[PDB]
């Protein structure tokens, strides 16, 4: 299961 | 034995032609189980392994939503990194991301990892302790400072030590019928005259899983690693893998050479003589 969200760089 | 779950993300910009092409893929060891393609018709996270279908409808709603969220972030980063490296908005640039976790034979956390790349070169990555960052250059540094103030590390750690593993166990259980299997290689050797006095011996390892394997040639029991040809392990397309290693030996001296095959699907390694 994927991360719930990836933060922008 | 040890097992891992890994996700792979690739964004490629197409300034003026369309949305950046986004492609994500998920793996459990060497078995791909899910995929997404912004160019496909479903626009949903899709299945790529029979056992994933054991999941319910809310699984697909959730993974689709999360994967689109990933695409949305990658889309912004393409822009963001463009500015950082002060590049023209015309050319195509790539962003790659990978992350996942490893578990022992008891299926407990061993390690977690999250890596980011820009155009095929390290950009930033979460170090081993899962609490610090490795920045490639000046640009990366700015992201790092931003990711520290934002505690991205803490989030990634929670996911990598908990959720990641939890799910890996889960897929492992549902995929036991296959994921936990090990297909030992069907091996054989080929002897074909090359010169008038030389002969080529090629060691073959076929139909094996996982892909991990070692093929080393020896002469009189000594490793011969400087007169051989080794091919990159390759996908058979039916779930198994293939690989071969060959050496050029003086014709008549073949009996001196042996090929050793290491594969966890094998009780003990194999020795082969022409």
């Amino acid at each position: 299961s994927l991360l719930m969200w990836i933060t922008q760089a | 034995g040890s097992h891992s779950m890994r996700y792979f993300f690739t964004s490629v910009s197409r300034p003026g032609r369309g949305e950046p092409r986004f492609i994500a893929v998920g793996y459990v060891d060497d078995t791909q189980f899910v995929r997404f393609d912004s160019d496909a018709a479903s626009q949903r996270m899709e299945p790529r392994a029979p056992w994933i279908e054991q999941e319910g409808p809310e699984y697909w709603d959730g993974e689709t939503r999360k994967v689109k969220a990933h695409s949305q972030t990658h889309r912004v980063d393409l822009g963001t990194l463009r500015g950082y490296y002060n590049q023209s908005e015309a050319g195509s640039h790539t962003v790659q991301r990978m992350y996942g976790c490893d578990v022992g034979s008891d299926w407990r956390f061993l390690r977690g990892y999250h890596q980011y790349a820009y155009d095929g070169k390290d950009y930033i990555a979460l170090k081993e302790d899962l609490r610090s960052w490795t920045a490639a250059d000046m640009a990366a540094q700015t992201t790092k400072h931003k990711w520290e103030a934002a505690h991205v590390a803490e989030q990634l750690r929670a996911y990598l030590e908990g959720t990641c593993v939890e799910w890996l166990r889960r897929y492992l259980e549902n995929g036991k019928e296959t994921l936990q299997r090990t297909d030992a290689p069907k091996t054989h050797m080929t002897h074909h005259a090359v010169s008038d006095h030389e002969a080529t011996l090629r060691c073959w390892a076929l139909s094996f899983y996982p892909a991990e394997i070692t093929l080393t040639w020896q002469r009189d029991g000594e490793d011969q690693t400087q007169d051989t040809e080794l091919v990159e392990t390759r996908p058979a397309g039916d779930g198994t893998f293939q690989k071969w290693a060959a050496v050029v030996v003086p014709s008549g001296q073949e009996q001196r050479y042996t090929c050793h095959v290491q594969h966890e699907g094998l009780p003990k390694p194999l020795t082969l003589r022409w």
Binding site: - | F8, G120, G237
Partner: protein
């Protein structure tokens, strides 16, 4: 903006045997950027019944794809893999070889 030339390998899924259905693979790897053209040729002419796996990559960020298509090996039919890439000035061809 580094670039990596693709490695090519044209092999079959199962051990070749004329007259019996099998799959022709063309595994390309180590290239970058991902933009790449790959074709499977049967006697010089391309095949359109060709599929490929989802784009993925190795630890070094180099990409790899597997192009494949069902087929039946014979004695008069020759195959290969036509591969084109930004790092190549000429579409490279690698004829299929059974014992390899």
């Amino acid at each position: 903006m580094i670039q990596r030339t693709p490695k090519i390998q044209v092999y079959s899924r199962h051990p070749a045997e004329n007259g019996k259905s099998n799959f022709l693979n063309c595994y390309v790897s180590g290239f970058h950027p991902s933009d790449i053209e790959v074709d499977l040729l049967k006697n010089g002419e391309r095949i359109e019944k060709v599929e490929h796996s989802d784009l993925s990559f190795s630890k070094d960020w180099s990409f790899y794809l597997l192009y494949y298509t069902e087929f039946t090996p014979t004695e008069k039919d020759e195959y290969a893999c036509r591969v084109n890439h930004v790092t190549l000035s000429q579409p490279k061809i690698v004829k299929w070889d059974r014992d390899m």
